[PDB]
Design a protein around this ligand. Structure first.
Ligand SMILES: [Fe+2]
Lengths: 340, 340
C-alpha cells in the first residue's frame, strides 16, 4: 500500500513526520517544522566536489608514515568508508517510504545524496595514496574489527525496512504467511523507527566524530592535508546531518508530532541509553584496535577514549538521555579549529 | 532479503546491474559501465540552486498574460511539478533497493536528488508569480486532467515496488498469504522493472521535452524569462537523465549484462512499443487540453503534436523500437536556442 503519488488531496501541514499519507506534490512554500527547510538550504549551499580537492602530496605523506601509523590512518579511513556507504543508501531505502511531509522527504534525499559525495571523496583519497585500492576496499568487508560495528548499525536499518514491508503489504493485525501467523503492529514499527533514528544519531554524532579526531590528528602534524581538507568539508556536513536527527528525535519524543511517538519514546529510554553507551564502548574498543601497537603525536588510546566519552555525554544530553560518563572536558581542543 | 550492507565480499564488476548481491562498499575507482560514472560527474558539474535565479519580473509577465495563456503556462508548470515530485522519490524507492552495482546506485541517488532541485525550482517559480500558491498545488492533485497523466507513471513504479517487496519478503516460488496462493517469479519482477524503465524513459525523453516547448515558447516572446532560465537548467539535467535510462535499457536488452533480461526485453517489445505510442497519444490529448481556449505566438495544438511525433520517433529508435510517425524536420527548431 505505498504509492509514489498518493491521489487523495491532504493538508501536508497537518500530517505527522512519519506514517501518514505518503507525500504527493513536493512543495517548499510551507513548512510544518522550519528546521528541515533550513537544513536543505544549508546543505545545498555547502555543495562540494571531492574531485576538486587536491590530494597530491598525500601519497607521499602516507607512504612515509611508519607501519602502525599507516594502520591507524587506513583503518580509520576504512571505517569512514564503511559508514558512508551505508549512510549513502540506507536513509533513502529505510526512511523515504515512511515520510509524510515534503520538506522532510527532500531533506532525507538531500542528506543521503551528500553521503554519496562523501563515499566518492574516500575513493578519491584511497585510490591516490594506496597502491592497490582493491585491497583496502575488500578489507572493509572481511576485516572482523571493522565489521563488528557494521552489523549493529545496519541491523537497525534492516529490521525497520523489513517491518515496513510487512506493514505496507499486509497491514495491521495477525496474518497467515505460509501457514504461520505474523503480527504486524504499527506501534512496534514506530519503535523500530525511533530506535533506528537513535542509532543513526549515534553514528553521525559520535562514531563519525571519533574518526574526525584521527584524521585531524594527522593534519595537525601537517600530514595528509588533502585528506584533512576533505574531512573538514565532510564534518561541516555531519553537523547538519546530526542536527536533523536530533530535531527528528526531540520532536517525536516531545509528542509535538505523533503523540503515540512521545509514549514510545518513553518506553524506549533504556534501550536508547544502552545503544548510545554501547556505541561509545565500541568506539573505545576501536581505539584499542587502532592503538594496539602504538600511538602518534597528538593521539593515543587515553586521549581518544576520553574524547569518546566527552562527545557521548554531549550528544546523549542533546537528545534527553542521562550522561553515562564523569568526563567533562575535551582532551583535543584543537579539533575545534578543524570543525565547523 | 534486502540488507543495507551485504557482509559477503563480492567482485562488483561481475554483478548484474539489478537483482544481484546488494551493494556494500560504495567504491568509484572501478566501473563496470563507464556511462554511469560519467553521468554522475556531469550532474555534479551541473549543480545549480533555483534559489539563485531571479524570477521577480516573471510575476508581471504572468499577470499580464490573457486568461487562456495563463491557462497554457500554469497547466504546463503544474504538469512539470507533478512529474518532478514523482521523479524526486520514485527512483530511490523503486530502483535503489534492486541495484547491485555501486556506480549505478550512486547515479540513481544523484539523479533523484537533482529531481528534488527541480521540484524546489517549481516552488520558487509558483510562489513568485501567483497569489495563492496553495490553489496551484492543490489543483495538481484534484485536477482530473493532470492526475490522469500521473496514473500510468505511478502504476509502473508502484507495481515494481510492491512486487520487489514480496520478493524480498518471500523469495521466489509459490507461497500463501492469508490462504491466497501468491506466486513470486523473479522473471516477472525483471519484466516489471524493464517496463518501469521504459515508462521512465518515455517520461523524461518525451513528456518533459513536450513541456520544455511550452515554457520556451513564452521565452521566445521574451516572457517568463526567469522560468525560462530555470527550464534551461532543468533541460540540461534531463538530457543526462534520459541518457541514463537509454543506456540502462540498451545494456539490459543487449544481454551484455544479464541474459534473462535480453530475453525478457524481446518478450515484451510489443508492450514497450504500445507504451511509447500511448505516452505520445496522451501528450497529444494534453496539448489538446492546453489549447482548448486558444494558442499563442509560436505554439498551438498542431505544432505541439508535430513536436510530440518528432521527438517520439527519435526516442523510440534510440531504444530500438519501431517508429510510429511520419518523418519530418524539427517543427520548432527555435527550441535549440534553449536546449543545452
Ligand atoms: Fe497571445
Amino acid at each position: 500500500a505505498y504509492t509514489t503519488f498518493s491521489q487523495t488531496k491532504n493538508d501536508q501541514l497537518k500530517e505527522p513526520m512519519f506514517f501518514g499519507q505518503p507525500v504527493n506534490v513536493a512543495r517548499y512554500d510551507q513548512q510544518k517544522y522550519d528546521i528541515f527547510e533550513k537544513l536543505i538550504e544549508k546543505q545545498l549551499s555547502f555543495f562540494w566536489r571531492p574531485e576538486e580537492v587536491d590530494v597530491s602530496r598525500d601519497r607521499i605523506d602516507y607512504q612515509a608514515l611508519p607501519e602502525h601509523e599507516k594502520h591507524i590512518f587506513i583503518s580509520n579511513l576504512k571505517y569512514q568508508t564503511l559508514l558512508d556507504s551505508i549512510q549513502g543508501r540506507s536513509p533513502n531505502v529505510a526512511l523515504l517510504p515512511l515520510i509524510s511531509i515534503p520538506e522532510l522527504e527532500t531533506w532525507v534525499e538531500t542528506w543521503a545524496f551528500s553521503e554519496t559525495i562523501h563515499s566518492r571523496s574516500f575513493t578519491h583519497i584511497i585510490r591516490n595514496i594506496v597502491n592497490d585500492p582493491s585491497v583496502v576496499f575488500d578489507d572493509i568487508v572481511t576485516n572482523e574489527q571493522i565489521q563488528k560495528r557494521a552489523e549493529g548499525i545496519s541491523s537497525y536499518y534492516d529490521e525497520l525496512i523489513e517491518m515496513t514491508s510487512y506493514w505496507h503489504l499486509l497491514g495491521e493485525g495477525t496474518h497467515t504467511v505460509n501457514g504461520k501467523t505474523v503480527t504486524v503492529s504499527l506501534r512496534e514499527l514506530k519503535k523500530k523507527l525511533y530506535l533506528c533514528l537513535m542509532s543513526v544519531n549515534a553514528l553521525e554524532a559520535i562514531r563519525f566524530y571519533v574518526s574526525f579526531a584521527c584524521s585531524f590528528a594527522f593534519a595537525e602534524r601537517e600530514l595528509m592535508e588533502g585528506n584533512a581538507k576533505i574531512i573538514r568539508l565532510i564534518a561541516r556536513d555531519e553537523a547538519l546531518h546530526l542536527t536533523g536527527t536530533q530535531h527528528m528525535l526531540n520532536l517525536l519524543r516531545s509528542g509535538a508530532d505523533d503523540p503515540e511517538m512521545a509514549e514510545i519514546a518513553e518506553e524506549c529510554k533504556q534501550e536508547c541509553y544502552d545503544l548510545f553507551v554501547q556505541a561509545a564502548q565500541q568506539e573505545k574498543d576501536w581505539a584499542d584496535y587502532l592503538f594496539r601497537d602504538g600511538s602518534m603525536i597528538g593521539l593515543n588510546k587515553d586521549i581518544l577514549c576520553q574524547y569518546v566519552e566527552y562527545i557521548t555525554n554531549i550528544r546523549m544530553q542533546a537528545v534527553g538521555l542521562d550522561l553515562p560518563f564523569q568526563t567533562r572536558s575535551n582532551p583535543i581542543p584543537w579539533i575545534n579549529t578543524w570543525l565547523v
